[PDB]
Design a protein around this ligand. Structure first.
Ligand SMILES: [K+]
Ligand SMILES: [Mg+2]
Ligand SMILES: [Mg+2]
Ligand SMILES: [Mg+2]
Ligand SMILES: [Mg+2]
Lengths: 132, 208, 260, 101
RNA sequence: AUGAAAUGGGAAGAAAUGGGCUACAUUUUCUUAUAAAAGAACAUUACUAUACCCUUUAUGAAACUAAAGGACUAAGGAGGAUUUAGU
C-alpha cells in the first residue's frame, strides 16, 4: 500500500483541507504547485539552490508564526523578487502581525540578498474541504 | 489489443466487392449493409489483393521466421519454390512424352498436395476419466491437423539435414518426396496413426 | 555479351574479362612479383582467366607468335617466334608464372594488333574496380591499392586509347563493387575522379529498363517455356501486377517470375 | 552543525580541492603531454603526489545536502531519492509531477 | 570511549546455488554494403573465449578499472527430471 502524502481515512471526524485531501498523483491534475520558480524548466540552472531556499523559507515561517498558519505557504519568485503568500489564522492581535511582517521581511532580505515581501490573507478558521 | 471489440476483420477479396448486387446471397448482402455502420480493422502489411498471394504459403513462411526476420523467411520460401520448379523442369525435359504428361511443374500445387498428404487425421489426446488421465484416440480438428503437417515439415528440414545443405535444398527435396507419399514426414504421420491404433480400446472414453 | 558475340563471329580476338571485381577482393593467395617487387601476383585469379581466354581464342593461339624472348625461370624461357599458345601453356602448367603469362599475353596482343594481323576486342565488365579501392591486405595488415596488384596494372594499359586495331567495350557494375553505395550507377560516382579521367573521352551508352514492347516480349518468352506456372500469371491482372512489382526491371522480373 | 561527521569530512575535501585547483592544474599539465623531457615529467609526477591527499578532487562524494546519504542522490537537486520524493509528493517542487503515460 | 581523526588493509575457493551474458553455427562465419545484393569461408579448431596472458589508449595523484588490438586458444555439437515468460 502507498503511504506517501496520503491523509488516511478515520471515522469521518478528521477535517482535511483541499491540499491534504489529494494524494500525490493529483499534482498537476486537481491541485497545483506550492512553489513557482523557473529552476526546473528545461535548460535552466540553480534548481538545487531554489529548492534549498524553499525548505528553509517554510521552516522559518512556521516558527515565526507559530500556530497561526491555516495552510501551507505559497512561494512565488519573479526576477530576483521573492513573494510569500500565507493563509494565517486570526489568533494574534493585528499590531503583532505588522511587527512579524516587518521583521520577517527585513531578516530574509538580508539573508538571501533579494527583495522579499510577505502577503498575508487572514482566515477566521481553517477551511475544511471534506471530513474523512 | 488496440482494436475495440466492435471492430471487424477486413475483407480483401477484390471480386467480392465488384460482383453484381443480385449475385450476392442475401446473407452476404446483409453483412455489407451492416458493415457500412461498423468499424473496420486496418489490413495487415502482408494482406493484399494480389492474385499471387496464397494464405497457406504465407502461413508456412511465418512458421519459419525467426526473430521477426520476414525478409529471410520469405526469401527461403521463394528459393524453395524455385528449387522445386527447377527440379521438375529438369525431370520433364529428360523424360519421354508419356512420362512428361504425369510430371507436375507447378510448385504451388506440389506444396499444397504435399502438406495435405502429411496431415494426420486422428491423434492421441489426454482425456480425464475418473479423475485420471488416459491417452484416448481423438479426431483431430482442422486447424490442429493443418498445423501438425507444417510443423513436422519445418522440423525435419531444420534438424535432420547435413551441415552444409541449405533449407531451400532440404525443403524442396522434402516437399517433393511428400508429394509422392514416401518421406520421413509421412512416416511421422504413420506413427501417430499407428499409436492410436494400439490405444483404440480407450476410444469410447470420449464424451463428444 | 551481345557485343562480344558480334565480334567473335567476325573472327575478332576476344579479350574478355568477365568480372574485374574478383581481382580486388577475397584473394587467398597473394604472392610478390619478380618483375617488380612492389607489385603482387594473384596466381589463382590469373590461372582461371587464362583457361577461359584459351578456350575462346584457341584458333588464334597458333597464328600469333611472340616478338620477344621471355625467361619464365632459369631453366625455362620462350624463344622469339614461338606460337602465343606456348606462353599460355606455360602459365597453366606453372601457376607461379600464371600472373606473368597474362601480362605477356596482354602486351603481345596490344603490340601485334596494330600490325593488321587480327582485330582485338578488349571487353572488360566491371571496369570501375580498376581505379577504386581493394579489400586485400599486405603482410603488415595494411590494405593494398589497385595499382600495386599485377593483374590490375596490366589491364589499365589495355583500356587506354594509345593503340589501334580494335575497340574497347567497358561496363560499369555497382554489384560486387567495394565501398560504393547501393544506389550508385552513374559513371563519375562509380569510376571516381581517377577512373573518369583515365577513360575520357569515352562514349556512355545508357542501358534503361524494359520498354512496353520489350516487357511484353520477355513476358511471353517466360510463358513460351512454361516458366510462369502459376494459374493467374497468364492473366491480364497477373501481367499488370508483375509489371508493377518488377517495375520493368529485367533482373527483378526474372526474380519475381522465378518463384512463381 | 552539519548532518554527520561524514558530511563534515566531505566539506573539507571540497574546500581543500578549491585551494589546490590551480596548483594541481599547472603541475599536472606538465605531465599530460609528450613535448617536455621525461626527466621533468618524472619529477612533476612526484610534486603532484606530494600535495595533500584531500587536495585530490576524486575523493569528493556527492551526498544529499539534507541527509548526507552517499548514494541515491539526484545531482540536479542534491537530494537523495527519499528526500526528493517527500518534497515532490507534497507539491513543493516547482514543476515536478508524477509520470503517467 | 561504544566518541573524533590519520595511515595501511578488508584476503581467497578441485564448493553448492539463483539470475544474466555469449556460444554451440548453414535461417551460419568474414568483407563491401547498408541491411537489399554480391564475393569468399564452411569440421578440427571451420563455428567458437566480455576467461588467462601480452601490448596500446582513456580517467585518476595512484590502474588494482574500462576500452581497443594481439596472439593463445580450451570447452561446447542445442542440453535429465524439472521449471520461467509471453494474448
Ligand atoms: K571511535
Ligand atoms: Mg547523526
Ligand atoms: Mg566518486
Ligand atoms: Mg542483407
Ligand atoms: Mg596515465
Amino acid at each position: 500500500k502507498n503511504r506517501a502524502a496520503r491523509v488516511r481515512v478515520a471515522k469521518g471526524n478528521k477535517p482535511v483541507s483541499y491540499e491534504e485531501a489529494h494524494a500525490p498523483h493529483y499534482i498537476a491534475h486537481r491541485k497545483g504547485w506550492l512553489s513557482l520558480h523557473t529552476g526546473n524548466l528545461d535548460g535552466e540552472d540553480h534548481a538545487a539552490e531554489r529548492t534549498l531556499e524553499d525548505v528553509f523559507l517554510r521552516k522559518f515561517m512556521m516558527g515565526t508564526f507559530p500556530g497561526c498558519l491555516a495552510d501551507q505557504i505559497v512561494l512565488k519568485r519573479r526576477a530576483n523578487q521573492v513573494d510569500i503568500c500565507a493563509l494565517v489564522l486570526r489568533q494574534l492581535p493585528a499590531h503583532k502581525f505588522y511587527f512579524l511582517v516587518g521583521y520577517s521581511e527585513t531578516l530574509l532580505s538580508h539573508f538571501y540578498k533579494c527583495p522579499v515581501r510577505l502577503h498575508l490573507q487572514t482566515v477566521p478558521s481553517k477551511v475544511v474541504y471534506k471530513y474523512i | 489489443s488496440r482494436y475495440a471489440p466492435e471492430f471487424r476483420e477486413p475483407l480483401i477479396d477484390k471480386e467480392y466487392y465488384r460482383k453484381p448486387v443480385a449475385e450476392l446471397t442475401e446473407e452476404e448482402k446483409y453483412d455489407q449493409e451492416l458493415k457500412k455502420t461498423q468499424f473496420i480493422k486496418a489490413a495487415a502489411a502482408t494482406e493484399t489483393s494480389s492474385v499471387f498471394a496464397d494464405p497457406v504459403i504465407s502461413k508456412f513462411t511465418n512458421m519459419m521466421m525467426k526473430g521477426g526476420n520476414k525478409v529471410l523467411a520469405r526469401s527461403l520460401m521463394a528459393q524453395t519454390l524455385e528449387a522445386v520448379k527447377r527440379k521438375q523442369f529438369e525431370k520433364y525435359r529428360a523424360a519421354s512424352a508419356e512420362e512428361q504428361a504425369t510430371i507436375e511443374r507447378n510448385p504451388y500445387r506440389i506444396f499444397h498436395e504435399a502438406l495435405k498428404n502429411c496431415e494426420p487425421v486422428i491423434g492421441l489426446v489426454p482425456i480425464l476419466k475418473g479423475g485420471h488421465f488416459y491417452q484416448v484416440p481423438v479426431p483431430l480438428a482442422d486447424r490442429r491437423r493443418r498445423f501438425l503437417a507444417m510443423k513436422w515439415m519445418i522440423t525435419e528440414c531444420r534438424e535432420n539435414k547435413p551441415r552444409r545443405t541449405l533449407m531451400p535444398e532440404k525443403l524442396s527435396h522434402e516437399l517433393l518426396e511428400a508429394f509422392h507419399n514416401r518421406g520421413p514426414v509421412i512416416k511421422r504421420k504413420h506413427n501417430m496413426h499407428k499409436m492410436a491404433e494400439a490405444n483404440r480400446a480407450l476410444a469410447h472414453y470420449r464424451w463428444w | 555479351c551481345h557485343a562480344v558475340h558480334f565480334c567473335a563471329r567476325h573472327d575478332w580476338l576476344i579479350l574478355h574479362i568477365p568480372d574485374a571485381h574478383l581481382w580486388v577482393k577475397n584473394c587467398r593467395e597473394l604472392l610478390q612479383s619478380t618483375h617488380n617487387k612492389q607489385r603482387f601476383d594473384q596466381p589463382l585469379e590469373a590461372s582461371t582467366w587464362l583457361k577461359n581466354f584459351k578456350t575462346t581464342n584457341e584458333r588464334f593461339l597458333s597464328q600469333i607468335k611472340v616478338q620477344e624472348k621471355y625467361v619464365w625461370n632459369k631453366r625455362e624461357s620462350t624463344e622469339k617466334g614461338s606460337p602465343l599458345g606456348e606462353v599460355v601453356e606455360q602459365g597453366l602448367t606453372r601457376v607461379r608464372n600464371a600472373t606473368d603469362a597474362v601480362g605477356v599475353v596482354l602486351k603481345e596482343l596490344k603490340a601485334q594488333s596494330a600490325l593488321g594481323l587480327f582485330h582485338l576486342l578488349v571487353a572488360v565488365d566491371g571496369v570501375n574496380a580498376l581505379w577504386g579501392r581493394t579489400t586485400l591486405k599486405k603482410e603488415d595488415r595494411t590494405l593494398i591499392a589497385p595499382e600495386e596488384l599485377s593483374l590490375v596494372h596490366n589491364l589499365r594499359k589495355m583500356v587506354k586509347n594509345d593503340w589501334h586495331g580494335g575497340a574497347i567495350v567497358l561496363s560499369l557494375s555497382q554489384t560486387g563493387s567495394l565501398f560504393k553505395s547501393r544506389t550508385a550507377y552513374l559513371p563519375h560516382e562509380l569510376l571516381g575522379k581517377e577512373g573518369f579521367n583515365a577513360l575520357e573521352p569515352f562514349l556512355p551508352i545508357l542501358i534503361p529498363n524494359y520498354n512496353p514492347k520489350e516487357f511484353e516480349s520477355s513476358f511471353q518468352y517466360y510463358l513460351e517455356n512454361n516458366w510462369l506456372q502459376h494459374e493467374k500469371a497468364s492473366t491480364e491482372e497477373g501481367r499488370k501486377e508483375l509489371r508493377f512489382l518488377s517495375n520493368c526491371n529485367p533482373e527483378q522480373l526474372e526474380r519475381l517470375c522465378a518463384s512463381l | 552543525y552539519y548532518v554527520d561527521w561524514r558530511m563534515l569530512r566531505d566539506l573539507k575535501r571540497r574546500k581543500m580541492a578549491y585551494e589546490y585547483a590551480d596548483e594541481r592544474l599547472r603541475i599536472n599539465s606538465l605531465r599530460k603531454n609528450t613535448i617536455l623531457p621525461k626527466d621533468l615529467q618524472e619529477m612533476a609526477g612526484d610534486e603532484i603526489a606530494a600535495l595533500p591527499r584531500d587536495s585530490c578532487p576524486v575523493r569528493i562524494r556527492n551526498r544529499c545536502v539534507m541527509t548526507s546519504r552517499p548514494r541515491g542522490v539526484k545531482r540536479r537537486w542534491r537530494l537523495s531519492r527519499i528526500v526528493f520524493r517527500h518534497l515532490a509528493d507534497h507539491g513543493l517542487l516547482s514543476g515536478v509531477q508524477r509520470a503517467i503515460w
